[PDB]
């Protein structure tokens, strides 16, 4: 199968450079060009550039000066680098491949890299339990508090629990740190038999926490 | 650069209904237009290429037409899994540009929320901060009121709300309201109440606990 997998999300300071690595499989960089697209609150979807099979590069006009795309055919890696970022350069950055080697209909996308431009510093979150205590249905969850920057991933029982899971959008607190809750509803009779763990990963800080959630 | 205007910004339809998205171009671009779907926390998914040609693996209820400046993406019988934003992209002129997108919302029957309240954990109290969480689960429509009360005193300004996007299966929303206190304030009070107002309830529902028990 055809895939594109980009490097992790993270913080870049004002006036500093952004660097993302796009690793591909299911095809060869010598037969297809790799495009770069971003998606920002201010400007939405926005085509940035492309590196072709033969190594040539095209850059969208407002980025010719601060954009540089390179690759390594043998290692199947495309390297994205953009210089002197400002606040409005915060966006989801994607690498993508078209259907045919020369075209622009983007059938394959990377999972995206959320980039935050801020002179603040990284901070891992604390994880606190939302302990259960109607109609045989019990609610429980995890509180993922005081981290920066976005994002954080949450799953349940190492991916085995998905039904009834609600992970809420993060909200920015007055401290400038983010916070979210992730909940799941389960049968109350299963609280004695099953273990419920929320798997929290905050990649910008290499903070990885499994929190067991029990009735108090 | 070609300007692409998608109309309208929000579409709200019911399951099984037909629905059309509109993408207009600032000048003629022939049939050089592509359509994309974006589900919650997803990357764009290619639906149609060159105005009308189908894409492998995309279900048949998706189709598109148009030429020149006026184009239409269509879903002839919409489903709950179709909840997403939809974009158009032109590539008749360099550089390729995207439209701003249309949001597709789904109507469904009124559903009352299931309310749960969580006191703060002793683990969090050790840092000197208390978070009281109120959960409104699986309700429709989105509008709802959460009123916090501590020892019959109305709380204002010290809570924050987060709402999920629409569920792809049952089309509901879920809401979290988090009331945040200092530990000193939390220890000085007893009765913590969350009152929920929603169209699906014939009375406000209150979930409360006494600190300790």
């Amino acid at each position: 199968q055809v895939q594109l997998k980009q490097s992790g999300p993270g913080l870049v300071q004002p006036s500093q450079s952004l660097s993302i690595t796009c690793t591909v499989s299911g095809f060869s960089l010598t037969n297809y060009g790799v495009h770069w697209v971003r998606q920002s609150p201010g400007k939405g979807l926005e085509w940035l550039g492309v590196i072709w099979s033969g190594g040539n590069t095209d850059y969208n006009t407002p980025f010719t000066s601060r954009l540089s795309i390179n690759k390594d055919n043998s290692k199947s890696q495309v390297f994205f680098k953009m210089n002197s970022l400002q606040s409005n350069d915060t966006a989801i950055y994607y690498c993508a491949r078209a259907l045919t080697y020369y075209d622009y209909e983007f059938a394959y996308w990377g999972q995206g890299t959320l980039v935050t431009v801020s002179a603040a510093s990284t901070k891992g979150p604390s994880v606190f339990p939302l302990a259960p205590s109607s109609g045989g249905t019990a609610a429980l969850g995890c509180l993922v508090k005081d981290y920066f920057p976005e994002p954080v991933t949450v799953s349940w029982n190492s991916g085995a629990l998905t039904s009834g899971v609600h992970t809420f959008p993060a909200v920015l607190q007055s401290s400038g740190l983010y916070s979210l809750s992730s909940v799941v509803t389960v049968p109350s009779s299963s609280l004695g038999t099953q273990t419920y763990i929320c798997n929290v990963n905050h990649k910008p800080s290499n903070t990885k926490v499994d929190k067991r959630v029990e009735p108090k | 650069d070609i300007l692409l205007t998608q109309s309208p910004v929000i579409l709200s339809v019911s399951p099984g209904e037909r629905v059309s998205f509109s993408c207009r171009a600032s000048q003629s671009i022939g049939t050089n237009i592509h359509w994309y779907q974006q589900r919650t926390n997803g990357s764009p998914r290619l639906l149609i290429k060159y105005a009308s040609e189908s894409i492998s693996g995309i279900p048949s209820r998706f189709s598109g037409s148009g030429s020149g400046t006026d184009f239409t993406l269509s879903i002839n019988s919409v489903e709950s899994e179709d909840i997403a934003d939809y974009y158009c992209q032109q590539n008749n002129n360099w550089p390729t540009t995207f439209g701003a997108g249309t949001k597709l919302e789904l109507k469904r029957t009124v559903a009352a929320p299931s309310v749960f309240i969580f006191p703060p954990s002793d683990e969090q109290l050790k840092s000197g901060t208390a978070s009281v969480v109120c959960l409104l689960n699986n309700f429709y429509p989105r509008e709802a009121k959460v009123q916090w009360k501590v020892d019959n005193a109305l709380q204002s300004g010290n809570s924050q709300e987060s709402v999920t996007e629409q569920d792809s299966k049952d089309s509901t929303y879920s809401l979290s309201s988090t009331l945040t206190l200092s530990k000193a304030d939390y220890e000085k009070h007893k009765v913590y109440a969350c009152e929920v107002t929603h169209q699906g309830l014939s009375s406000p529902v209150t979930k409360s606990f006494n600190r300790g028990a």
């Binding site: 609150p41 | 910004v9 990357s43």
Partner: peptide, 12 residues
Amino acid sequence: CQFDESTRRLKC
């Protein structure tokens, strides 16, 4: 409507 990086959805 504005795009939201947290949810990758448009918020109107």
